[PDB]
Design a binder for this molecule. Structure first.
Ligand SMILES: C[C@H]1CC[C@H](c2ccccc2-c2cc(-c3ccccc3)sc2C(=O)O)CC1
Ligand SMILES: C[C@H]1CC[C@H](c2ccccc2-c2cc(-c3ccccc3)sc2C(=O)O)CC1
Lengths: 557, 557
C-alpha cells in the first residue's frame, strides 16, 4: 500500500532556478546574513521523493465510523450548485499553469472560444468515463526559507482544462460543506482576529485548560484510497445536480484516488496512490480527513470536553487537563490511535498549559496593549520565514508577494509593522508603485491587492487597535530580537528613522498615500495622531475572504 | 554635431580580403548560383563612410525626462561588482585582436605577467585621467550576403588592454542592469522559444492587438554625446564601488562619447562623436537608448496598453488597437517623436494585425504542428543570409561558424533542419570532426560548441517539439522554396535522401553521434521514432546563455 511508485525519471524544472539569495542595492538595508537565506529547487526533489514514499496500513474501528456517521448526517443538509464554465473560468489565477492543449490562464479568464470548447470536452469525458486515470504534472516548489536545508516540496496537479472542471463540480461544495460538517472547528472561516477570539474563548471555557497541536508526518502521503473514497461519500451526501454527482464520482476515481505522474519534459515519473497536493479538494479533503481521524482519536484517548480547530492538516485541540502526567499518557493514546488511522506524527505532541505557547498554522496567540492601555489578544508567528522571503522579494519579482500577505494577516505584529511595512513602502514609493495591484495569497487563494488599500483592509480585518499596539509580551519581544540578531536585521532605531521618512514621503502625496502614512506609521512619531475610521473601508467588498481554504486549489478571489 | 569627421586617410584591410564566393567540391551540393553570394570588403568603406556621416539634432521634452526618471529609479536598485583581472581575462575570446603593446588574447587568457601588468597600467591610467580620448581602430567588416551589393559595415574598437578594463568596470553592470530597468521588455533575457512565448502572450493579452517594428536608420550614428552621458548617468544610479564609478566615468569621457579613429596601418582616419560599434557597452547602451526614446515616443503618440520588446537598436511594439485609421496616425506621431530624439527611421513603420507579419531581429513568429498535431509557435527568419553564409563556410574556415549559431537559434525551422543540419553533419562525418569544438555567436557573445552536443542544446532551448515539427505555414513554405530557387539550392527529395544517409552513418557510430542521427534526422524517415528526453541535457550548464546581449563586446563563454 505504497503512497508512490517511481520510474527513476527526474522531477524537472520549467525555467531557470536560483537557490542562493539574489542581492541588489536594497538587500543589506533588510538583512546582512545572506548565506542563511535559500530557495528550494528541483535539485533536491529526489530527497523529497524518498520522504513522501512509504507503506500505509489502516485499521478502522467504531470511534472512526461513529464520527463519520455524524459528519455525513451534517453533510446531508448541504445543497451545492454546479458552476457554469464561465463562472469557473473567472476563478482561475491569471498566472495559472497553461494547458497542454494550446491555451493558457489568460485565455481561460477571457472566456476564449478555444479554452471554453476544450473545457466542455473535458467535462463530457468526465461524465462518460469514470475509470481512466487522469494525467498529472509533478513539479518541485520553489520556496524560500532560513537555514536550520529542507528539500523542495512537491506539487501534483492535473491539466488546466481539468482544473476548470473541478471548480464547476466542486467549488460550491468545498466552499460550503466544511463549515457545515465541522462547525466552529473549521479554521478557514475565521480571519486572524476571529481565530484569536475562538482560541481565547475556548481556553477560558475550560476549568483547567490543556492544549496541544498535532503534526502528522507528510499528511498528504498518509491519505489512503479509503480516505479519499470516504471524502467522496461525504460530498455525495450533499443535495447535488445529477451531472455534479457524476463529475464528482469520476474525479474521485480518475484523479483524487491516484494517477500517473509526468514531469515538465513529458516523461513518466511514477504513480500516486495518495492525496494530490495540487487539486481543488486538497484543502477540504485534508481538513475533513484530519477532523475525522482526530475526533475519533480524541474518543479513543478519552479526552474530556474537547474543542478542536482544524485547517487542512493543521490541528489544535484544547481540552480539560487531568494533570501533567495523565495528559502526557492521553496524548500517547491519541497518537497511537492517529497512527492506526494512518496519520503518524512527525514531532510527538506536547501538552501546553499557556495559550501563548501553542503553535498552530505556524501561529500563536499573543497579547499587547492598545492606545488606551487595554489588553489586546492578536495573532503572531515566528518572523524568520516571513523575513527570509521578504529578503528574496527585495531583489526579485515573484508570482506571490509573501510580504503583502504577511502584512495583511499579521498587521498588528511588532515585526510586520516595524519591518515589513517600513521596508516595502520605502521600495514602492521610490518606484512610484504604490497604485500597482500585486498578487498575494490568503488561505491558499490568490488576491490582487493595491498596497494603497492596506489601511482600509487592516482596519476591516483587525480594527483600529492594529495601528496603536505597543507593550508587547516578553516572549514576543525576545523572539523578534533573537530573529533580528540571527538574520542580521537592523535594530529598532533604524526602522523608526526609516518609518518617519516613509511616513513623511507618503503624507505629502495626499489621498490614499497620506492615509498609508497616517495610519501605518503612527507608531513612529512622538506626537501620535487621533486614528479614526476610514470612510473608504466601508466600500471594500471583503466577501469571499475567510470563508474556506484553497491551498493547491488554483483559486483567484 | 556631426557623427564623424574624416581626414581622407583610407579604411585599410588587416589581411587579404576575398569578395567572390570560394568554391570547393562541396559547394554545388548546397548552392549553384555562386555569383549571387559575395563578401563585403574595405573597397566599399568609402560608401559606408558617406552613409554613417550626418548632423544630429536633438530636442528633448518632458516625456523623455519622465521616462528617464523612471529608468533611473529602477537602476538605483542595482548592485554591481567589479570583476577581478582574472575574471575579465577569462571572458576574453581566444582569437580576440592582439594588443598593440606586445601581447595577445592567449597571453590575457593565461594571466601572463606582461598582459596582467599592461592591464594594471591601463586601469591605473583610467583612474588617474578622465579626459584623454582613447585611441580606436576602425576596420571594414568582411560579411557575406546574397545580392539584392551593400557596402561593408564598420567596426570601431579600443586596444585589448582597454577591453579587459571595460569588463572589470562594466561586465556585471551590462549583464544585470538592462533586465532591472526594462523588465520583460529586455529582449536578450529570452531564448528564441521564450521570445516567441513572450510575443504570443503579449499579442493575446490585448483585446484588439496591433503591432509594429521600428527601424532606425544607422542607429550607432544617431547616438549623440547627450545619449552616451545619459547612459552613464543610468550606470551611475547603481550601487557601485567608488573605483568602478571612476573607471565608468573615465571610459565614458575618453572612449564611449567619442575619440580618434586609426586605420590598420596606424594613420589617423578621423574622429567619432557617436556610438562605437566594438565596445562592451554597445549592446546595453543601444538597448537603453532605444528603449528610452521609444517609450517616450509611445507616450507622445498616445499608444494604449504598450508592450515593447527591445534588443539593441531592434524594437517591437504591441499595443491596444484604437482602430485602423487611429493606429496609422499614432505611428506617424511616434516616428516624428523618434526623429526629434535623433532616431529617424530607415523604412517607415507599418501597423500589423497579424503577429506572423511583424519582422524584428530579422525574425518573425510562425506556426507549425508537432507529432500530436498541436499548433506550435516558433521563431524563423528569411533563410537567404544564413544560406549564403553557409555556402561561404562550406569552402572556407571562418572565425565564427554562422551555420552552427543558426542551427542553435533556428533549430525548429524547416530550412535549418532540412538544409543546415543535413549539409554540415555530412561534412563533419566525412572529416571525422563531429567531436571538434567550433566557435559560434549567440546574442553577440562567443561560445565554443561541439556539434555532437546539438540534440541536448536544442532540447533545452526549444523542447522536443523542435525534432517533430511539420505542416509549416504556406507563407513559410513559399519563402523557403523561393529562397531555394533564388540561390539554386537543391529540392526536398535531395535533402531528404541525404538526411537518411547522414542519419544512417551517425546511428552506427553509437553514443552522442547516434543521438544526433536519431533526434536531428527523425523527420527524414517513414517510420518515425518516438523521441524522449536525453539524460545529458539535464547536466548541460546553459548559465549565461540568454542573460544579456554583447554584440561587439568581445565576450567569450
Ligand atoms: C511597530 C512599533 C510598535 C511599538 C514599538 C515601541 C514603541 C515605543 C517603545 C518601545 C516599542 C517596542 C519596541 C520593541 C522591540 C522589541 C524587540 C525588537 C525591536 C523592538 S517592543 C516595544 C513595545 O512596546 O513593546 C515600536 C515599533
Ligand atoms: C525538416 C523537414 C520537416 C518536415 C518536412 C516534410 C515532411 C513530410 C511531408 C512534407 C514536409 C514539408 C516539406 C516542405 C517543403 C516546402 C518547400 C521546400 C522544401 C520542403 S514543407 C513541409 C511541411 O510539412 O510543412 C520535410 C523536411
Amino acid at each position: 500500500h505504497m503512497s508512490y511508485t517511481w520510474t527513476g525519471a527526474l522531477i524537472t524544472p520549467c525555467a531557470a532556478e536560483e537557490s542562493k539569495l539574489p542581492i541588489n542595492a536594497l538587500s543589506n538595508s533588510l538583512l546582512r546574513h545572506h548565506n542563511m537565506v535559500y530557495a528550494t529547487t528541483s535539485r533536491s526533489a529526489g530527497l523529497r521523493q524518498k520522504k513522501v514514499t512509504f507503506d500505509r496500513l489502516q485499521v478502522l474501528d467504531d470511534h472512526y465510523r461513529d464520527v463519520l456517521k455524524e459528519m455525513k448526517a451534517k453533510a446531508s443538509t448541504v445543497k451545492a450548485k454546479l458552476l457554469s464554465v464561465e463562472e469557473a473560468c473567472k476563478l482561475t489565477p491569471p498566472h495559472s499553469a497553461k494547458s497542454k492543449f494550446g491555451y493558457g490562464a489568460k485565455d481561460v479568464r477571457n472566456l476564449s472560444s478555444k479554452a471554453v470548447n476544450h473545457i466542455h470536452s473535458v467535462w463530457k469525458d468526465l461524465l462518460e468515463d469514470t475509470v481512466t486515470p487522469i494525467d498529472t504534472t509533478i513539479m518541485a516548489k520553489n520556496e524560500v526559507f532560513c537555514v536550520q536545508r529542507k528539500p523542495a516540496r512537491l506539487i501534483v496537479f492535473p491539466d488546466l482544462g481539468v482544473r476548470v472542471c473541478e471548480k464547476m463540480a466542486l467549488y460550491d461544495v468545498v466552499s460550503t460543506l466544511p463549515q457545515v460538517v465541522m462547525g466552529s472547528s473549521y479554521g478557514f472561516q475565521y480571519s486572524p482576529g476571529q481565530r484569536v477570539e475562538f482560541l481565547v474563548n475556548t481556553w477560558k471555557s475550560k476549568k483547567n485548560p490543556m492544549g496541544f497541536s498535532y503534526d502528522t508526518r507528510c499528511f498528504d502521503s498518509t491519505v489512503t484510497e479509503n480516505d479519499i473514497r470516504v471524502e467522496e461519500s461525504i460530498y455525495q451526501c450533499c443535495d447535488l445536480a445529477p451531472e455534479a454527482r457524476q463529475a464528482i464520482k469520476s474525479l474521485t476515481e480518475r484523479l483524487y484516488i491516484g494517477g500517473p505522474l509526468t514531469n515538465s519534459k513529458g516523461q513518466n515519473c511514477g504513480y500516486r496512490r495518495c492525496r494530490a497536493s495540487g487539486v481543488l479538494t486538497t484543502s477540504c479533503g485534508n481538513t475533513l480527513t484530519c477532523y475525522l481521524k482526530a475526533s475519533a482519536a480524541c474518543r479513543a484517548a478519552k479526552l474530556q470536553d474537547c474543542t478542536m480547530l482544524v485547517n487542512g492538516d493543521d490541528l489544535v485541540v484544547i481540552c480539560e487537563s487531568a494533570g501533567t502526567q495523565e495528559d502526557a499518557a492521553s496524548l500517547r493514546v491519541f497518537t497511537e490511535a492517529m497512527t492506526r488511522y494512518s496519520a503518524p506524527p512527525g514531532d510527538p505532541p506536547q501538552p501546553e498549559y499557556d495559550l501563548e505557547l501553542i503553535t498552530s498554522c505556524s501561529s500563536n496567540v499573543s497579547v499587547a496593549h492598545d492606545a488606551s492601555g487595554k489588553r489586546v489578544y492578536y495573532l503572531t508567528r515566528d518572523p524568520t520565514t516571513p523575513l527570509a522571503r521578504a529578503a528574496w522579494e527585495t531583489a526579485r519579482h515573484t508570482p506571490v508577494n509573501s510580504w503583502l500577505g504577511n502584512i495583511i494577516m499579521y498587521a498588528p505584529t511588532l515585526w510586520a509593522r516595524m519591518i515589513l511595512m517600513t521596508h516595502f513602502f520605502s521600495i514602492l514609493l521610490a518606484q512610484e508603485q504604490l497604485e500597482k495591484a500585486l498578487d498575494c495569497q490568503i488561505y491558499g487563494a490568490c488576491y490582487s491587492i493595491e498596497p494603497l488599500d492596506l489601511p482600509q483592509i487592516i482596519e476591516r480585518l483587525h480594527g483600529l487597535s492594529a495601528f496603536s499596539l505597543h507593550s508587547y509580551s516578553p516572549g514576543e519581544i525576545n523572539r523578534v530580537a533573537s530573529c533580528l540578531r540571527k538574520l542580521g536585521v537592523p535594530p529598532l532605531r533604524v526602522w523608526r528613522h526609516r518609518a518617519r521618512s516613509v511616513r513623511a514621503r507618503l503624507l505629502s502625496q495626499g489621498g490614499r498615500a497620506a492615509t498609508c502614512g497616517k495610519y501605518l506609521f503612527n507608531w513612529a512619531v512622538k506626537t501620535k495622531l487621533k486614528l479614526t475610521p476610514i470612510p473608504a473601508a466601508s466600500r471594500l467588498d471583503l466577501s469571499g475572504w475567510f470563508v474556506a481554504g484553497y491551498s493547491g486549489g488554483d483559486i483567484y478571489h
